[PDB]
Structure 1
Amino acid sequence: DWVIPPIKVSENERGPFPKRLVQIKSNKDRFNKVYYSITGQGADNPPQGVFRIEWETGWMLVTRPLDREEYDKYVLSSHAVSENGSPVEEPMEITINVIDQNDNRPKFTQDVFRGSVREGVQPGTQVMAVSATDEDDNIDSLNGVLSYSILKQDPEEPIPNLFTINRETGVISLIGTGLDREKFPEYTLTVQATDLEGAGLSVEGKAIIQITDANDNAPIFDPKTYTALVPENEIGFEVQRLSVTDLDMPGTPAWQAVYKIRVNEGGFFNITTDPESNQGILTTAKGLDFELRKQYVLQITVENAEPFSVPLPTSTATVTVTVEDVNEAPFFVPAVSRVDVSEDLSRGEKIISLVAQDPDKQQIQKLSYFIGNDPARWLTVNKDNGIVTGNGNLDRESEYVKNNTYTVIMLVTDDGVSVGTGTGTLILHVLDVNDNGPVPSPRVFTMCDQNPEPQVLTISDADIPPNTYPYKVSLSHGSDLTWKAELDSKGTSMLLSPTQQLKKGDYSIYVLLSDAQNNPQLTVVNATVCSCEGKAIKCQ
């Protein structure tokens, strides 16, 4: 058909109501009276009564103002019946479009936006982002397009133009330079959005930016030069602690100190760090020792764990140390294999005039010499002059003496001012003299009767050679009660044989030898005889 165009109507209209929109006519009215009515939402349906028609003229009206924001369009159905009561025309659809008007102010997405950036970054860096909206049209008008802006950053210091915002997108960026967490950490700037691309109505928001941290700062010592005293030897011990103040953020690696000495003399120092006021705690690496050095001039520089965000001054601490003195024990010089001395020494004679030395050249402390180790008592010392003399009777020949030795240990004490011990061994070579003289091996026989065979006997000397070289056998009172002497060819033994057919048991034979001579006297080597033929038998 020839329909009927949609009807545009403005919003928030205002004048004298009613307002005729249009007029409709059924031509089938030649016959009876026609009754015009109309139906739909806004008509008889909810919102009832916005539009109504004059049953007799065919006029359509808007009865009151409208807000497209509420309902932006309506569709209606129109009718025409006869007085008799019958419909005449197939109904007719009707449309109305509600044209937008700038009745709406915009509104920010949130009531407050927050942001953060680091202090050392470069100009032209994107920080935050902000939103807002207008409910009016924005597809055929500007009643709903906004334009963003900024008008007041607080801390109007260092300067007041650190940022800008993209008018269309509302994004903010760092424009200037001079950000420092250490002086001004959080800005509060006021934003506004406007109707018709900055032309219409405006509103406010608030965005707040916190500033991350940077290693803008270096560490600073609170003393620059310290001093402490120290002892030579127990040690590995705490000398002095140090103080400092970095200014970036505390629990952070831009706040933790790292040290080191420049030069470690004997490399006898270690230094650690501590999460207190991360003071510098210095200590001794390997004890000290001395009388060698009293002075210690060393320097320690301090850094952070992480590198610096800028060239900065490295700052050292210069420190002086002094070693207190402890006084140590003295010592005999050697451990003496000294005196190759003979057995004939006169009880009270100079053996070893000895001396001991003591470390501490503070030496105005003497000591006393004491002896100590010990198989039995011979020797003697002058305690205030360390003089070892030889008292007593010695005898290389016999008991304690093991290999050609006699080892003895002695002491010495550090007095004068405190304490001390000195353990020193002393081996002294004893010597030989020909003391003893020759002696027979077996002392009792068992001779036989009829024809006894030679009674083997031998010789032994306690002395050391030559002193036991060859012999000379001799038979004293009974050199004839019949007894005849004899030597083995290979030196050592002697052959003892009677020369008479003598008696039934129990009787001695006086013996007498010599080796350089010395002559011993020996003696009786008794002789038990019991009935027989010729071989030395078990007796009775």
Structure 2
Amino acid sequence: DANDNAPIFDPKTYTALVPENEIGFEVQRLSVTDLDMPGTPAWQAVYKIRVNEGGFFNITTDPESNQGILTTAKGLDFELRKQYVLQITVENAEPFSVPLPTSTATVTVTVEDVNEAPFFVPAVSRVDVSEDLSRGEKIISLVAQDPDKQQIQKLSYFIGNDPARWLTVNKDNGIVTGNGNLDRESEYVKNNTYTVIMLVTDDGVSVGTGTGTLILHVLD
């Protein structure tokens, strides 16, 4: 036998759908037909993409009908891109016994969306506030942000961490007011501090959590 033949794809252009993030996962498989002798290196396919955008793709070969098995190199992420036009050429392991036509496969990808958790913006060393505060007064009018611009999903603001009960939140407007009697003078307060953490949840359409710390400067 001789490497008289080159490999030929059975589709020339494919398509597949994909998800943003669990991932490193099988997108689509490809078909081809070289005509020289089967168990031979004049029959084993070798691939490669022409251009690897963020270099987030890997493709292996398989001794089945030595189909082209493409996958995800490093998860995706997005709301950044939906389209992927890339091309893969196929060779044999051993060079050709004649000039031949190299034949590519052109392929299109689409990224499905998964919706992620929201986040308070910072982790706040905010309110240098005094001990004389009136039980029920504006301390920190805060806000959190959520990724997915599909944004027709709101959330609810919940508090959480805790030495004892002073502060209070409007859950549908994230407003931290100050209820209670405080006293810079004494117990939990360690260095001039009082640190508290709170939460926020992604609803509207699925699930979410947001852990944000909050240090507030008490006064004398």
TM-score, structure 1 normalization: 0.40
Aligned residue for 2:106, secondary structure, equals strand
Report Cα offsets for 1:431-460 as digits up to 9, x if no partner.
xxxxxxxxxxxxxxxxxxxxxxxxxxxxxx
List runs of 5+ in structure 1 lacking aligned partners: 1-212, 430-539
Deviation per CA, 1:497-534: give whole Å up to 9, x if none.
xxxxxxxxxxxxxxxxxxxxxxxxxxxxxxxxxxxxxx
Partner of 2:166: 378
State the distance in 1 between where 2:10 and 2:16 align: 16
- Measured after TM superposition, the shift of residue 407 of structure 1 is 0.0
Give the distance between the partners of 2:2 and 2:15, measured in 1 at CA: 34
* Residues 335-354 of structure 1, C-alpha deviations (whole Å, 9 max, x = no match): 00000000000000000000
Shift of 1:406: 0.0
Instruction: For residue 263 of structure 1, give the secondary structure of its aligned residue in structure 2.
Output: coil
Alpha-carbon distance, 1:300 to partner = 0.0
- Cα deviation code 1:259-293 (max 9, x no counterpart): 00000000000000000000000000000000000
Deviations 1:270-324 (A, max 9, x none): 0000000000000000000000000000000000000000000000000000000
Could you tell me how far 1:216 is from its partner in structure 2?
A: 0.0
Higher relative contact order (CA 8 A, sep 6+): 2
| SS state at 2:40 partner | coil
CA distance in 2, matches of 1:323, 1:312: 36
Shift of 1:418: 0.0
**What SS does the aligned partner of 2:58 have?**
strand
Post-superposition Cα deviations, 1:413-437, rounded to whole Å, max 9, x if no partner, equal 00000000000000000xxxxxxxx
The structure number with the bigger radius of gyration is 1
Matches within 5 A, 1:172-191: none
Match of 1:225 in 2: 13
SS of match in other structure, 1:288: coil
- CA-to-aligned-CA distance 1:35-74 (integer Å, 9 cap, x gap): xxxxxxxxxxxxxxxxxxxxxxxxxxxxxxxxxxxxxxxx
- What is the CA–CA distance in structure 2 between the aligned matches of 1:283 and 1:257, rounded to whole Å? 17
Cα distance in 2, alignment partners of residues 232 and 316 from structure 1: 27
Q: Distance in 2 between matches of 1:265 and 1:338?
A: 42
Distance in 2 between the 1:400 and 1:337 partners? 17
Counterpart CA distance in 2 for 1:385 and 1:316 is 55
Give the distance between the partners of 2:40 and 2:171, measured in 1 at CA: 68
Instruction: Give the alignment's Cα RMSD to 1 decimal.
Output: 3.0
Distance 1:288 1:390 in 2: 42
Q: Distance in 1 between matches of 2:16 and 2:205?
A: 25
**Partner residue of 1:282?**
70
Q: Distance in 1 between matches of 2:89 and 2:46?
A: 8
Secondary structure of the 1:266 match is coil
Residues in 1 aligned to 2:45 and 2:181: alpha-carbon distance in whole angstroms: 76
Once the two structures are TM-superposed, the CA of residue 409 in structure 1 deviates from its matched residue by 0.0
Between the aligned partners of 1:261 and 1:280, the Cα distance in structure 2 is 11
Whole-angstrom CA distance in 1 between matches of 2:106 and 2:53: 15
Cα deviations by residue, 1:91-129 (Å, 9 ceiling, x for unpaired): xxxxxxxxxxxxxxxxxxxxxxxxxxxxxxxxxxxxxxx
- Aligned partner of residue 323 in structure 1, secondary structure: strand
Q: What is the alpha-carbon distance in structure 2 between the residues aligned to residue 364 and residue 220 of structure 1?
A: 47
- 1:157-191 per-residue CA deviation (whole Å, 9 max, x = no partner) reads xxxxxxxxxxxxxxxxxxxxxxxxxxxxxxxxxxx
Q: Separation in 2 of the partners of 1:283 and 1:329?
A: 26
- TM-score normalised over the length of structure 2: 0.99
Shift of 1:239: 0.0
- Structure 2 distance, partners of 1:236, 1:328, is 18
- The residue that corresponds to 1:335 in the other structure is 123
The whole-number CA distance in structure 2 between the counterparts of 1:262 and 1:243 is 18
1:396 positional shift = 0.0
CA distance in structure 1 between the partners assigned to 2:9 and 2:88 by the alignment: 10
Unaligned runs of 5+ in 2: none
C-alpha distance in structure 1 between counterparts of 2:122 and 2:147, whole Å = 15
In the comparison of the two structures, how many residue pairs are matched?
A: 218
Identity across matched positions, percent: 100
CA distance in 2, matches of 1:425, 1:415: 21
Between the aligned partners of 1:359 and 1:321, the Cα distance in structure 2 is 22
Shift of 1:250: 0.0
1:392 shift after superposition:
0.0
Deviation of residue 404 (structure 1)?
Answer: 0.0
Shift of 1:232: 0.0
How many angstroms apart in 1 are the aligned matches of 2:164 and 2:176? 15
Deviation at 1:377, TM superposition (A): 0.0
SS at 2:193 equivalent: coil
